[PDB]
Amino acid sequence: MLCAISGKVPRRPVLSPKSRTIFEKSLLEQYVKDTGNDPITNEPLSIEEIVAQQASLTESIPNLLTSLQNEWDAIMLENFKLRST
Amino acid sequence: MLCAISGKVPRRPVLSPKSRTIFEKSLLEQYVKDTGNDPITNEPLSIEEIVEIAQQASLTESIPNLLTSLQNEWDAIMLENFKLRSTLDSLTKKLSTVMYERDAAKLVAAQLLMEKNEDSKDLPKSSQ
Amino acid sequence: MLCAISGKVPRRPVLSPKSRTIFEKSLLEQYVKDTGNDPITNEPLSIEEIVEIVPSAQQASSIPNLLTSLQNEWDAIMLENFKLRSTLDSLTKKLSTVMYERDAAKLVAAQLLMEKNEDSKDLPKSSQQDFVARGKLKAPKWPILKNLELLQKTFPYKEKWVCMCRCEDGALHFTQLKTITTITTPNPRTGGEHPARLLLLYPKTNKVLREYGHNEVNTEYFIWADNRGTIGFYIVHSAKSDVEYSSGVLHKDSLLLALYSPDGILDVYNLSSPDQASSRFPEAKIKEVKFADNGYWMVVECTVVCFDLRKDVGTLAYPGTVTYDIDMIAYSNESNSLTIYKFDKKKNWTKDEESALCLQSDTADFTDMDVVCGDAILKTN
Amino acid sequence: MDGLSFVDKPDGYKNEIDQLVKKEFANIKADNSVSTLTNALYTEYLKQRNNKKRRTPDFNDDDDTLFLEEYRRKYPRIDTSRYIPNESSEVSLLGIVDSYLKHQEIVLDTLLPQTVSNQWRINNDYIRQTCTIVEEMNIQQRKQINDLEIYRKRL
């Protein structure tokens, strides 16, 4: 949603394969042309290094399972409040 | 923004350096242990080769999570894959009707290629 | 459940707070007293730095793993759905490329047909400007069917007995108690017959009564057709065609066969699939069909029409034919009389000795003689 | 193989050619137990029944409804705590996810254009080829007809 270099909403997002972070193509391209590096980690990166199943949006099976962790992990701390007291 | 295995919206996306494609960590970690290669490109890939890189508003009426929501999830998983198995079966049947009708047309063309040129040849011979 | 110094099961698991690795209290203490260090990372560590003894306090010694199990099974669900979808879309590419290319290739024909047509009118408008009678009963006269033993021996069916006769000795070897189909097994001791609703298998005895007739290539099975609209080996009919089958013959390789119909069709069947794979149309009841040993010719009668099975086309028509048989150099026909044609140039022999209908014709080995039967005599030529 | 689509400007011909193709067709003629119950559930068209118990219950019951009652309390307290942390943020948490969905949507329609352009671009190249050869075929046929009458008028 944001570009990490500028802070704007990038209109052509390209993700690097050395420091995993969504950069704007036009911004990161200039960073690479300055020096062949990734801006965050300062690891080497070139322009070529930068880059059928239909999905549906993340909503309230996997999201439901991680929800039930939050339920139990919170209730486990509720037990400590009464074990300690 | 999605995962390239399940069709998820990943909570901990990780990108492989052999083929630039973002997968959800659990699903890519499972593939590498099953058979150590990249699922899309079929290139050599390990767990160490991976490089690690969302809000859902829980409904107002959020009992239902145990009963109604969980029930719907395993209904929707069940009746989709069954219907998807139905779709795969017909594609293979409709494949056979395609290739047979294709080869049927090939024989027509081959039969007509001998027919036409010899009819044209006969007109050239007629003059004599 | 193992120490990281000796490798023993630790009965007092203590850990160093510089590198996370559970040792045993005895061994780590001996390492610290030797030199004040962590054994794995060689960092600074002392005895007081170690966290000793078990941890259970305000805890109590299910549920959490059920959710873990629910994740593990879902992990497979996703993996399965991926591989199922890949093949789904990857097959759709073949479907799409074919259908497009099919209708593309279809337009080739439409063009080709109209040009071919143009060539016709153009050129047309321009060019313009022994005889044995005692095999069967004299009082119920007639032989209705004939076969020769493939491995050597004559078999006839009579206006109700099946007879085996030896041409050399001129003796009837067996009279087996109307018969309209007969088949001689190559084993010489088995003969088969059929009639107006049984098939009978004979040794001078009938060993089976099974309730057109053709022996399968293996020698072990009989194909039959009937007026009841079925063929049998399994027993099948065509709902769509729904009519009497008038004759039946296996192709020599034993994978396909033909059945003639009362409504003038020659139906080709796949034996394994039990399906009707092709039908040859073009009048009246089919009377006889014969497959050539060349494996690609089929002759049919109702005219005698010749089919190339590689093209599924009628390449020649010779305009009562009751019986057809190839020797593959020669084709014989019989009914009103006996005629033999050379297959290469399509008539080489013509016999009219029988009085009334000829019911069967056959070639001796190497075509060294011909045989025919009639409504009482069996004749050799 | 060759059949010019752009150049060849009926339905009768499709119906005609279909019959000739039809006549030549007349001539030729990894999971565990999970998969078993899932396929059975989908085939039978029946979902496994869940716990329809917490909703109904009844006062002055027994030791069984003493449990069922105590269940309703703890879950209602969890419920009322589960509604508190939602209302605290309120609509901010919802509209923050609404923004994510707009970034997700626009990405798809960019690919709709990229496909649209390359699909029309391939067809664009084909068009020129069709018109190139269609002329050459026209040239051939004219020359064909010339000979046809030329050979006659000589004889």
Side-chain angles (χ1 to χ4, degrees), chain C residues 9-10 13-14 16-17 19 21 24-27 29-30 32 35-36 38-39 41 44 46 48 51 54-57 60-62:
Chain C
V9 301
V14 320
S16 188
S19 68
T21 202
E24 219 289 326
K25 197 178 69 184
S26 300
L27 297 155
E29 181 168 344
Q30 291 157 39
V32 291
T35 43
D38 190 69
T41 53
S46 57
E48 66 267 346
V51 162
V54 287
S56 30
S61 29
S62 170

Short mmCIF file of all heavy atoms in Angstrom, two decimals, chain C residues 9-63, unseen atoms left out:
data_model
loop_
_atom_site.label_atom_id
_atom_site.label_comp_id
_atom_site.label_asym_id
_atom_site.label_seq_id
_atom_site.Cartn_x
_atom_site.Cartn_y
_atom_site.Cartn_z
N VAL C 9 19.56 -38.58 28.43
CA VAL C 9 18.25 -38.04 28.80
C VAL C 9 18.39 -37.26 30.10
O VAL C 9 18.70 -37.85 31.14
CB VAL C 9 17.21 -39.16 28.97
CG1 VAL C 9 17.08 -39.94 27.69
N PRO C 10 18.18 -35.93 30.06
CA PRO C 10 18.48 -35.09 31.23
C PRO C 10 17.45 -35.23 32.36
O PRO C 10 16.27 -34.99 32.13
CB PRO C 10 18.46 -33.67 30.66
CG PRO C 10 17.51 -33.74 29.51
CD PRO C 10 17.61 -35.14 28.95
N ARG C 11 17.91 -35.61 33.55
CA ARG C 11 17.03 -35.73 34.72
C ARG C 11 16.93 -34.42 35.52
O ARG C 11 16.07 -34.28 36.39
CB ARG C 11 17.47 -36.89 35.64
CG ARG C 11 16.86 -38.23 35.27
N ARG C 12 17.81 -33.47 35.21
CA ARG C 12 17.70 -32.11 35.73
C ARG C 12 18.13 -31.12 34.64
O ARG C 12 19.27 -30.66 34.62
CB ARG C 12 18.55 -31.94 37.00
CG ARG C 12 18.33 -30.62 37.71
N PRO C 13 17.20 -30.80 33.71
CA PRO C 13 17.54 -29.99 32.55
C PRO C 13 17.74 -28.51 32.89
O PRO C 13 16.77 -27.79 33.16
CB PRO C 13 16.33 -30.18 31.62
CG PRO C 13 15.19 -30.45 32.54
CD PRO C 13 15.76 -31.12 33.76
N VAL C 14 19.00 -28.08 32.90
CA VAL C 14 19.35 -26.68 33.11
C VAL C 14 19.79 -26.07 31.78
O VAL C 14 20.30 -26.79 30.91
CB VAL C 14 20.45 -26.50 34.19
CG1 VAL C 14 20.22 -27.46 35.36
CG2 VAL C 14 21.85 -26.71 33.60
N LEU C 15 19.57 -24.77 31.60
CA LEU C 15 19.91 -24.09 30.35
C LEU C 15 20.76 -22.85 30.58
O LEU C 15 20.61 -22.17 31.60
CB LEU C 15 18.64 -23.72 29.57
CG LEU C 15 18.90 -23.31 28.12
N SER C 16 21.67 -22.58 29.65
CA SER C 16 22.50 -21.37 29.70
C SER C 16 21.73 -20.22 29.06
O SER C 16 21.06 -20.40 28.04
CB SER C 16 23.83 -21.60 28.97
OG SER C 16 24.72 -20.51 29.16
N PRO C 17 21.81 -19.02 29.66
CA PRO C 17 21.06 -17.85 29.18
C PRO C 17 21.92 -16.97 28.24
O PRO C 17 21.82 -15.74 28.29
CB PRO C 17 20.70 -17.07 30.47
CG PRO C 17 19.65 -17.86 31.24
N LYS C 18 22.77 -17.60 27.43
CA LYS C 18 23.54 -16.92 26.38
C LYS C 18 23.29 -17.58 25.02
O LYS C 18 23.13 -16.88 24.01
CB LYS C 18 25.03 -16.88 26.73
CG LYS C 18 25.32 -16.15 28.02
N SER C 19 23.26 -18.91 24.99
CA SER C 19 22.81 -19.67 23.82
C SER C 19 21.78 -20.70 24.28
O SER C 19 22.06 -21.57 25.10
CB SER C 19 23.98 -20.37 23.13
OG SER C 19 24.51 -21.40 23.95
N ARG C 20 20.58 -20.58 23.72
CA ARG C 20 19.46 -21.44 24.07
C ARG C 20 19.67 -22.89 23.68
O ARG C 20 19.42 -23.27 22.53
CB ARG C 20 18.23 -20.94 23.36
N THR C 21 20.10 -23.70 24.65
CA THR C 21 20.36 -25.13 24.42
C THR C 21 20.34 -25.88 25.77
O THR C 21 21.18 -25.63 26.63
CB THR C 21 21.70 -25.35 23.68
OG1 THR C 21 21.72 -26.64 23.03
N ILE C 22 19.38 -26.79 25.93
CA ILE C 22 19.16 -27.47 27.21
C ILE C 22 20.21 -28.56 27.49
O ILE C 22 20.27 -29.57 26.79
CB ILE C 22 17.75 -28.10 27.29
CG1 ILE C 22 17.56 -28.84 28.62
N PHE C 23 21.05 -28.32 28.50
CA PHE C 23 22.07 -29.27 28.94
C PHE C 23 21.59 -29.99 30.21
O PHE C 23 20.45 -29.78 30.65
CB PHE C 23 23.40 -28.55 29.22
CG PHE C 23 23.84 -27.62 28.12
N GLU C 24 22.45 -30.84 30.77
CA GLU C 24 22.20 -31.47 32.07
C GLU C 24 23.08 -30.78 33.12
O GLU C 24 24.22 -30.39 32.82
CB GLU C 24 22.50 -32.97 32.00
CG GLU C 24 21.52 -33.85 32.77
CD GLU C 24 21.66 -33.74 34.28
OE1 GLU C 24 22.80 -33.57 34.78
OE2 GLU C 24 20.62 -33.84 34.97
N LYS C 25 22.56 -30.63 34.34
CA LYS C 25 23.23 -29.87 35.40
C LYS C 25 24.65 -30.34 35.73
O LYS C 25 25.50 -29.52 36.06
CB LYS C 25 22.39 -29.89 36.69
CG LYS C 25 22.77 -28.82 37.71
CD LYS C 25 21.89 -28.85 38.95
CE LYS C 25 22.11 -30.09 39.81
NZ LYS C 25 21.17 -30.16 40.96
N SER C 26 24.90 -31.65 35.64
CA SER C 26 26.19 -32.23 36.03
C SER C 26 27.29 -31.83 35.03
O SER C 26 28.37 -31.40 35.43
CB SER C 26 26.11 -33.77 36.11
OG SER C 26 25.17 -34.25 37.07
N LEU C 27 26.97 -31.99 33.75
CA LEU C 27 27.94 -31.83 32.67
C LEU C 27 28.29 -30.36 32.42
O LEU C 27 29.46 -30.03 32.24
CB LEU C 27 27.43 -32.51 31.40
CG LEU C 27 27.24 -34.03 31.51
CD1 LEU C 27 26.21 -34.54 30.52
CD2 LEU C 27 28.56 -34.76 31.35
N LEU C 28 27.26 -29.51 32.38
CA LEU C 28 27.45 -28.07 32.20
C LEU C 28 28.23 -27.47 33.36
O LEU C 28 29.03 -26.55 33.15
CB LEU C 28 26.11 -27.35 31.97
CG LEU C 28 26.20 -25.85 31.65
N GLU C 29 27.99 -27.98 34.57
CA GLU C 29 28.68 -27.53 35.77
C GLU C 29 30.16 -27.91 35.73
O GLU C 29 30.99 -27.15 36.21
CB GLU C 29 28.00 -28.08 37.03
CG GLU C 29 28.62 -27.67 38.36
CD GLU C 29 27.74 -28.02 39.55
OE1 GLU C 29 26.53 -28.30 39.37
OE2 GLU C 29 28.26 -28.00 40.69
N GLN C 30 30.45 -29.09 35.17
CA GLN C 30 31.84 -29.54 35.00
C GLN C 30 32.56 -28.76 33.91
O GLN C 30 33.78 -28.60 33.98
CB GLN C 30 31.88 -31.05 34.70
CG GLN C 30 31.49 -31.93 35.88
CD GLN C 30 31.02 -33.31 35.44
OE1 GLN C 30 31.56 -33.89 34.50
NE2 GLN C 30 29.99 -33.82 36.11
N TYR C 31 31.81 -28.29 32.91
CA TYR C 31 32.37 -27.48 31.83
C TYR C 31 32.66 -26.07 32.31
O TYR C 31 33.66 -25.49 31.90
CB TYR C 31 31.44 -27.44 30.59
CG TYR C 31 31.83 -26.40 29.56
N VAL C 32 31.80 -25.53 33.19
CA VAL C 32 31.98 -24.18 33.73
C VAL C 32 33.16 -24.12 34.68
O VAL C 32 33.94 -23.16 34.65
CB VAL C 32 30.70 -23.66 34.42
CG1 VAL C 32 29.59 -23.40 33.40
N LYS C 33 33.30 -25.14 35.53
CA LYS C 33 34.43 -25.25 36.45
C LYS C 33 35.76 -25.50 35.75
O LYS C 33 36.82 -25.15 36.28
CB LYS C 33 34.19 -26.35 37.50
CG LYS C 33 33.07 -26.03 38.49
N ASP C 34 35.69 -26.13 34.57
CA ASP C 34 36.86 -26.34 33.72
C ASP C 34 37.32 -24.98 33.18
O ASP C 34 38.47 -24.55 33.40
CB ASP C 34 36.55 -27.34 32.58
CG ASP C 34 37.77 -27.65 31.72
N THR C 35 36.43 -24.33 32.43
CA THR C 35 36.64 -22.95 31.96
C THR C 35 35.29 -22.23 31.91
O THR C 35 34.32 -22.78 31.37
CB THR C 35 37.31 -22.90 30.57
OG1 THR C 35 36.71 -23.88 29.71
CG2 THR C 35 38.81 -23.18 30.66
N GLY C 36 35.24 -21.03 32.47
CA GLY C 36 34.00 -20.25 32.52
C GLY C 36 33.52 -19.86 31.13
O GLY C 36 33.80 -18.77 30.65
N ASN C 37 32.78 -20.77 30.49
CA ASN C 37 32.29 -20.55 29.13
C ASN C 37 31.08 -21.43 28.81
O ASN C 37 30.82 -22.42 29.49
CB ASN C 37 33.41 -20.81 28.10
CG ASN C 37 33.70 -22.29 27.89
N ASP C 38 30.34 -21.04 27.77
CA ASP C 38 29.28 -21.86 27.21
C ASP C 38 29.91 -22.84 26.20
O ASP C 38 30.69 -22.41 25.35
CB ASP C 38 28.23 -20.98 26.52
CG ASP C 38 26.99 -21.75 26.13
OD1 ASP C 38 26.23 -22.17 27.03
OD2 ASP C 38 26.78 -21.94 24.92
N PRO C 39 29.58 -24.14 26.29
CA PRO C 39 30.24 -25.13 25.42
C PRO C 39 29.91 -25.02 23.92
O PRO C 39 30.75 -25.37 23.09
CB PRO C 39 29.74 -26.48 25.98
CG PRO C 39 28.46 -26.16 26.67
CD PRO C 39 28.61 -24.77 27.21
N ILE C 40 28.72 -24.53 23.59
CA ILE C 40 28.27 -24.45 22.19
C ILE C 40 28.81 -23.20 21.47
O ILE C 40 29.36 -23.31 20.37
CB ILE C 40 26.73 -24.47 22.08
CG1 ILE C 40 26.28 -24.33 20.63
N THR C 41 28.67 -22.03 22.10
CA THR C 41 29.02 -20.75 21.47
C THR C 41 30.35 -20.13 21.93
O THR C 41 30.81 -19.15 21.35
CB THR C 41 27.90 -19.70 21.69
OG1 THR C 41 27.60 -19.61 23.09
CG2 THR C 41 26.65 -20.09 20.92
N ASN C 42 30.97 -20.71 22.96
CA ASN C 42 32.21 -20.19 23.55
C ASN C 42 32.09 -18.73 24.05
O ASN C 42 33.04 -17.96 23.97
CB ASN C 42 33.40 -20.34 22.57
CG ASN C 42 33.68 -21.79 22.21
N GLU C 43 30.91 -18.38 24.55
CA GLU C 43 30.65 -17.05 25.11
C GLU C 43 30.89 -17.11 26.62
O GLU C 43 31.18 -18.18 27.16
CB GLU C 43 29.21 -16.61 24.83
CG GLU C 43 28.87 -16.48 23.36
N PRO C 44 30.78 -15.95 27.31
CA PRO C 44 30.93 -15.94 28.78
C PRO C 44 29.71 -16.55 29.47
O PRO C 44 28.57 -16.23 29.13
CB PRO C 44 31.07 -14.44 29.14
CG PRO C 44 31.62 -14.39 30.57
N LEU C 45 29.97 -17.44 30.41
CA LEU C 45 28.90 -18.06 31.21
C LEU C 45 29.45 -18.53 32.56
O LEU C 45 30.58 -19.03 32.65
CB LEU C 45 28.22 -19.25 30.49
CG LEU C 45 26.97 -19.92 31.11
N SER C 46 28.62 -18.39 33.59
CA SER C 46 28.95 -18.82 34.94
C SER C 46 27.89 -19.80 35.46
O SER C 46 26.91 -20.11 34.75
CB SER C 46 29.05 -17.60 35.86
OG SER C 46 27.84 -16.86 35.85
N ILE C 47 28.10 -20.30 36.68
CA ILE C 47 27.18 -21.24 37.33
C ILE C 47 25.85 -20.57 37.71
O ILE C 47 24.78 -21.17 37.55
CB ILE C 47 27.81 -21.87 38.59
CG1 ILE C 47 29.01 -22.77 38.23
N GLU C 48 25.92 -19.33 38.21
CA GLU C 48 24.71 -18.57 38.57
C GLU C 48 23.89 -18.13 37.35
O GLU C 48 22.69 -17.87 37.47
CB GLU C 48 25.05 -17.35 39.45
CG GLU C 48 25.88 -16.25 38.79
CD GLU C 48 27.38 -16.39 39.00
OE1 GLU C 48 27.80 -17.18 39.87
OE2 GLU C 48 28.14 -15.70 38.30
N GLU C 49 24.54 -18.06 36.19
CA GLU C 49 23.87 -17.74 34.92
C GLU C 49 22.90 -18.84 34.49
O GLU C 49 21.90 -18.56 33.81
CB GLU C 49 24.91 -17.50 33.82
CG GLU C 49 24.34 -16.93 32.53
N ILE C 50 23.18 -20.08 34.89
CA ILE C 50 22.34 -21.23 34.53
C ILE C 50 21.00 -21.20 35.27
O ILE C 50 20.95 -20.89 36.47
CB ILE C 50 23.06 -22.57 34.83
CG1 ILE C 50 24.36 -22.74 34.02
N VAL C 51 19.93 -21.53 34.56
CA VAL C 51 18.58 -21.70 35.12
C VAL C 51 18.34 -23.19 35.37
O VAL C 51 18.16 -23.95 34.43
CB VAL C 51 17.51 -21.13 34.15
CG1 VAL C 51 16.11 -21.65 34.46
CG2 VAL C 51 17.57 -19.61 34.13
N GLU C 52 18.28 -23.60 36.63
CA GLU C 52 18.22 -25.02 36.98
C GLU C 52 16.80 -25.44 37.38
O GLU C 52 15.92 -24.60 37.54
CB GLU C 52 19.13 -25.20 38.16
CG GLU C 52 19.10 -23.92 38.95
N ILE C 53 16.59 -26.76 37.50
CA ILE C 53 15.33 -27.36 37.99
C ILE C 53 14.15 -27.19 37.01
O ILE C 53 14.19 -26.34 36.12
CB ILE C 53 14.96 -26.81 39.39
CG1 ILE C 53 13.94 -27.71 40.09
N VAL C 54 13.12 -28.02 37.17
CA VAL C 54 11.88 -27.90 36.37
C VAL C 54 11.16 -26.58 36.67
O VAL C 54 11.42 -25.94 37.69
CB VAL C 54 10.91 -29.08 36.63
CG1 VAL C 54 11.43 -30.36 35.98
N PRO C 55 10.24 -26.18 35.78
CA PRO C 55 9.55 -24.86 35.87
C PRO C 55 8.10 -24.86 36.40
O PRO C 55 7.59 -23.78 36.71
CB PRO C 55 9.59 -24.32 34.42
CG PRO C 55 9.22 -22.84 34.47
N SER C 56 7.42 -26.00 36.51
CA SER C 56 6.01 -25.99 36.83
C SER C 56 5.67 -25.31 38.18
O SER C 56 5.99 -25.85 39.24
CB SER C 56 5.55 -27.42 36.85
OG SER C 56 6.66 -28.20 37.23
N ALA C 57 5.04 -24.13 38.11
CA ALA C 57 4.60 -23.40 39.30
C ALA C 57 3.47 -22.44 38.90
O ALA C 57 3.61 -21.65 37.97
CB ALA C 57 5.77 -22.63 39.92
N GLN C 58 2.34 -22.54 39.61
CA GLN C 58 1.09 -21.82 39.26
C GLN C 58 0.65 -22.14 37.83
O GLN C 58 0.22 -21.24 37.10
CB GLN C 58 1.26 -20.30 39.45
CG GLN C 58 1.91 -19.91 40.76
N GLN C 59 0.74 -23.41 37.44
CA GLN C 59 0.44 -23.84 36.07
C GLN C 59 -0.49 -25.06 35.98
O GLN C 59 -1.38 -25.07 35.13
CB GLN C 59 1.75 -24.14 35.31
CG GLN C 59 2.52 -25.34 35.83
N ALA C 60 -0.28 -26.07 36.83
CA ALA C 60 -0.99 -27.36 36.75
C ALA C 60 -0.50 -28.20 35.55
O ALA C 60 -0.39 -27.69 34.44
CB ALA C 60 -2.50 -27.15 36.70
N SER C 61 -0.24 -29.48 35.77
CA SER C 61 0.28 -30.36 34.73
C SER C 61 -0.82 -30.92 33.84
O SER C 61 -1.74 -31.59 34.32
CB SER C 61 1.00 -31.49 35.43
OG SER C 61 0.36 -31.65 36.68
N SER C 62 -7.23 -33.03 24.68
CA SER C 62 -7.06 -31.73 25.32
C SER C 62 -7.78 -30.62 24.52
O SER C 62 -9.01 -30.56 24.53
CB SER C 62 -5.58 -31.42 25.54
OG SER C 62 -5.37 -30.08 25.94
N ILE C 63 -7.03 -29.77 23.80
CA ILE C 63 -7.62 -28.59 23.12
C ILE C 63 -6.66 -27.88 22.14
O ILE C 63 -7.00 -27.71 20.96
CB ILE C 63 -8.20 -27.57 24.15
CG1 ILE C 63 -9.18 -26.57 23.51
#
